[PDB]
């Protein structure tokens, strides 16, 4: 028994069971898009300048 | 008046009254009267203040 996952794992992710699954594995990026509805843009004289 | 400067706070050119210019003034007497654009480079809202 070499062992478990939960030691050996790079990028140290952290190896649960009742569902197999790694958690927080710090490698990749994640992208984002965000559909902002015209509603939430505040005009300039609504806001300190 | 004497001594009165026009800054433009807002100025966004859309079809409405879309543009907010504060006359910052110094004004012999207080009284009302009527404020004018003579092109057609805007379009006031209110006639006098």
Do not use: M, Q, W
């Amino acid at each position: 028994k070499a062992p478990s996952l939960k030691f050996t794992a790079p990028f140290g992710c952290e190896i649960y069971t009742n569902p197999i699954r790694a958690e927080n594995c710090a490698v990749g990026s994640i992208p984002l898009a965000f559909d902002i509805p015209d509603a939430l843009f505040t005009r300039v004289s609504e806001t300190p300048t | 008046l004497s001594a009165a400067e026009c800054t433009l706070n807002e100025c966004v050119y859309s079809s409405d009254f879309g543009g907010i210019a504060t006359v910052k003034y110094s004004a012999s007497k207080s009284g009302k009267c009527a404020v004018h654009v003579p092109s057609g480079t805007a379009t006031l809202k209110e006639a006098a203040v």
